[PDB]
Scaffold this active site. Structure first.
Site, short mmCIF file in Angstrom:
data_model
loop_
_atom_site.label_atom_id
_atom_site.label_comp_id
_atom_site.label_asym_id
_atom_site.label_seq_id
_atom_site.Cartn_x
_atom_site.Cartn_y
_atom_site.Cartn_z
N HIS A 236 0.81 -1.07 0.17
CA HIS A 236 -0.02 -0.19 -0.12
C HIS A 236 1.03 1.11 -0.03
O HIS A 236 0.57 2.13 -0.87
CB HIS A 236 -0.94 -0.16 1.36
CG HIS A 236 -1.54 1.31 1.45
ND1 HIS A 236 -3.03 1.59 1.31
CD2 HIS A 236 -1.15 2.30 2.17
CE1 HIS A 236 -3.12 2.71 1.59
NE2 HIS A 236 -2.14 3.30 2.01
N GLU A 237 1.80 1.25 0.93
CA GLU A 237 2.67 2.48 1.17
C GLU A 237 3.38 2.77 -0.28
O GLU A 237 3.09 4.07 -0.95
CB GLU A 237 3.75 2.44 2.09
CG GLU A 237 3.12 2.40 3.41
CD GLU A 237 2.77 3.78 4.01
OE1 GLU A 237 3.16 4.43 3.42
OE2 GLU A 237 2.04 3.70 5.06
N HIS A 240 1.59 4.71 -2.96
CA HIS A 240 1.36 6.30 -2.96
C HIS A 240 2.77 6.65 -3.84
O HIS A 240 2.51 7.70 -4.36
CB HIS A 240 1.79 6.63 -1.72
CG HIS A 240 0.25 6.50 -0.75
ND1 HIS A 240 -0.73 6.74 -1.13
CD2 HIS A 240 0.47 6.05 0.67
CE1 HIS A 240 -1.65 6.67 -0.15
NE2 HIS A 240 -0.92 6.09 0.95
N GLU A 316 -6.02 6.79 -0.83
CA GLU A 316 -6.17 5.78 0.04
C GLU A 316 -6.85 4.56 -0.63
O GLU A 316 -6.44 3.35 -0.61
CB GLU A 316 -6.64 5.88 1.50
CG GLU A 316 -5.70 6.92 2.34
CD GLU A 316 -4.58 6.02 2.70
OE1 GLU A 316 -4.67 4.94 3.76
OE2 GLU A 316 -3.50 6.17 2.10
C1 LIG Z 1 -2.14 -0.02 5.64
C2 LIG Z 1 -1.80 0.87 6.85
C3 LIG Z 1 -1.43 0.11 7.70
C4 LIG Z 1 -1.00 1.77 6.35
C5 LIG Z 1 -1.50 2.99 5.62
N1 LIG Z 1 -0.43 4.26 5.60
P1 LIG Z 1 -0.67 5.36 4.49
O1 LIG Z 1 -2.18 5.68 4.23
O2 LIG Z 1 -0.13 5.09 3.34
O3 LIG Z 1 -0.14 7.00 5.18
C6 LIG Z 1 -0.68 7.26 6.55
O4 LIG Z 1 -1.85 8.00 6.16
C7 LIG Z 1 -1.97 9.18 5.46
C8 LIG Z 1 -3.11 9.98 5.21
C9 LIG Z 1 -0.86 10.36 6.21
O5 LIG Z 1 -0.66 11.25 4.81
C10 LIG Z 1 0.50 9.63 6.05
O6 LIG Z 1 1.26 10.78 6.92
C11 LIG Z 1 0.41 8.53 6.89
O7 LIG Z 1 -0.11 8.75 8.11
C12 LIG Z 1 -2.75 3.44 6.30
O8 LIG Z 1 -4.04 3.03 5.95
N2 LIG Z 1 -2.81 4.24 7.52
C13 LIG Z 1 -3.98 4.70 8.19
C14 LIG Z 1 -4.43 3.42 8.94
C15 LIG Z 1 -3.41 3.57 10.32
C16 LIG Z 1 -2.40 3.06 10.48
N3 LIG Z 1 -2.03 3.30 11.84
C17 LIG Z 1 -2.94 3.55 12.49
C18 LIG Z 1 -3.42 3.80 13.98
C19 LIG Z 1 -4.49 4.33 14.34
C20 LIG Z 1 -5.76 4.50 13.21
C21 LIG Z 1 -5.54 4.23 11.97
C22 LIG Z 1 -4.29 3.62 11.63
C23 LIG Z 1 -3.76 6.05 9.06
O9 LIG Z 1 -3.01 6.75 8.89
O10 LIG Z 1 -4.47 6.11 10.25
ZN LIG Z 2 -1.98 5.23 2.63
#
Ligand SMILES: CC(C)C[C@H](NP(=O)(O)O[C@@H]1O[C@@H](C)[C@H](O)[C@@H](O)[C@H]1O)C(=O)N[C@@H](Cc1c[nH]c2ccccc12)C(=O)O
Ligand SMILES: [Zn+2]
Ligand SMILES: CCCCCCCCOCCOCCOCCOCCO
Length: 371
Positions: A236-237, A240, A316
């Site tokens: 996923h990362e 982006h 996303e």
């Molecule tokens: C597949 C997932 C594990 C990784 C994935 N990271 P990614 O979307 O690529 O990137 C993340 O979200 C973006 C909106 C921001 O701009 C980035 O800085 C980063 O925080 C994500 O869905 N992140 C969400 C889900 C998430 C990860 N850790 C969390 C802790 C609490 C709640 C939700 C989450 C988020 O940022 O929240």
């Molecule tokens: Zn993301």
């Protein structure tokens, strides 16, 4: 001058009432939704004049406007840092402690807070003296050079942050040799990603919360998920990157920065904007930036935030879909459920609150899409 002041204050109150309304609808869901729904059984079990006064007891008179501006910048950021502190302490040491997430002591917390404040000032003040100088010394097209300077500062900062700023605040270590390190390398090659090094940031020094970042790959140590799940999240990362979302965000932010500096140039001669906020005898450049960017641009800032939130949700879904493409939908599905559990995400939301606020689409919408 009265219409300007009144409209900024009434817009503020209006936004605040709209957001209080939305928050209440979401809070209602937390109090109402008291058993797992069936769609989810498988998913969870004055300051200006004060700054002048400091300047003149050090031998600097009012002609030294940038100097007084830098004093104002220091005091304003200090004031905001101090008034934020009770709230941040309560959130960290009551809320986060109570629900099992906080890992830090008060001494770590205060060491960290002072260091972040100092480092901020070390960068902020020199950069601010120059930007203010540029503004003063280059019209009628000063705003192009103002824009270009902030672009270059932004570029430098982002380029040095990993090596020279981030390690002041967190411990980074190479990912150890093993099965996960090698599958990451395979995946990165598979998409022509020029992977260099994989690092683990010891987020657990602060919190058990987990979160993956967007060259180098950095993974929180609390990220936990088995190896095949970490890989789908990386998939996923890396979406982006392959889909150019990061480049689109950079272009949007610099076009927006260009537009605001242009409009600042249009508006900054209007002495009524200053008088609205109690600046009668003078029109300091920094006060001008403050009033125009934060108060006058208020409605545009809100519309744009909202537009960026919708776009973010779209990116996303696209990144999820790229991991599906790579063949990792099943593992990403699993990964999102386990991270939602480790971080105690509540997977029902009010549709209006989530439309306004959520940069990431609700978990259930993401799982349906991966199917
Ligand atoms: C597949 C997932 C594990 C990784 C994935 N990271 P990614 O979307 O690529 O990137 C993340 O979200 C973006 C909106 C921001 O701009 C980035 O800085 C980063 O925080 C994500 O869905 N992140 C969400 C889900 C998430 C990860 N850790 C969390 C802790 C609490 C709640 C939700 C989450 C988020 O940022 O929240
Ligand atoms: Zn993301
Ligand atoms: C005269 C127009 C007022 C209509 C909107 C009411 C705004 C209330 O929001 C206040 C919320 O913020 C708390 C602090 O402000 C309190 C004063 O609000 C009084 C509004 O006249």
């Amino acid at each position: 001058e009265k219409r300007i002041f009144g409209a900024v204050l009434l817009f503020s109150w209006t936004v605040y009432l709209w957001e209080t309304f939305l928050a209440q609808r979401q809070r209602r869901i937390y109090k109402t939704t008291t058993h797992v729904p069936p769609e989810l059984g498988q998913i969870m079990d004055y300051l200006w004049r004060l700054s002048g006064r400091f300047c003149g007891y050090a031998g600097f008179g009012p002609e030294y406007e940038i100097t007084q501006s830098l004093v104002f910048l220091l005091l304003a950021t200090l004031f905001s840092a101090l008034a934020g502190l009770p709230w941040s302490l309560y959130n960290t040491f009551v809320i986060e402690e109570k629900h099992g997430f906080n890992q830090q002591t008060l001494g770590f917390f205060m060491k960290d807070a002072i260091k972040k404040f100092v480092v901020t000032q070390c960068i902020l003040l020199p950069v601010s003296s120059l930007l203010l100088y540029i503004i003063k010394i280059g019209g009628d097209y000063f705003f192009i050079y103002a824009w270009l300077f902030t672009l270059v500062v932004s570029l430098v900062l982002v380029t040095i942050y990993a090596d020279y700023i981030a390690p002041l605040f967190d411990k980074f270590t190479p990912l150890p040799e093993g099965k996960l390190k090698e599958e990451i390398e395979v995946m990165a090659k598979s998409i022509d990603f020029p992977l260099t090094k994989v690092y683990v940031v010891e987020g657990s020094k602060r919190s058990s919360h987990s979160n993956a970042y967007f060259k180098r790959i950095v993974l929180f140590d609390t990220l936990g998920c088995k190896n095949e799940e970490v890989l789908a999240v990386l998939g996923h990362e890396l979406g982006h990157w392959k889909l150019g979302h990061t480049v689109k965000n950079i272009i949007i932010s610099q076009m927006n920065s260009f537009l605001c500096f242009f409009l600042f140039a249009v508006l900054i001669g209007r002495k009524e904007l200053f008088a609205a906020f109690g600046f009668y005898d003078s029109q300091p450049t920094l006060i001008g930036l403050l009033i125009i960017f934060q108060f006058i641009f208020s409605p545009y800032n809100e519309v744009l935030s909202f537009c960026l939130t919708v776009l973010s949700r779209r990116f996303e879904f696209q990144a999820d879909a790229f991991a599906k493409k790579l063949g990792k939908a099943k593992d990403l599905y699993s990964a999102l459920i386990k991270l939602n559990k480790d971080n105690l995400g509540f997977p029902v939301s009010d549709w209006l609150f989530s439309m306004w606020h959520y940069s990431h689409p609700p978990l259930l919408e993401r799982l349906q899409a991966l199917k």
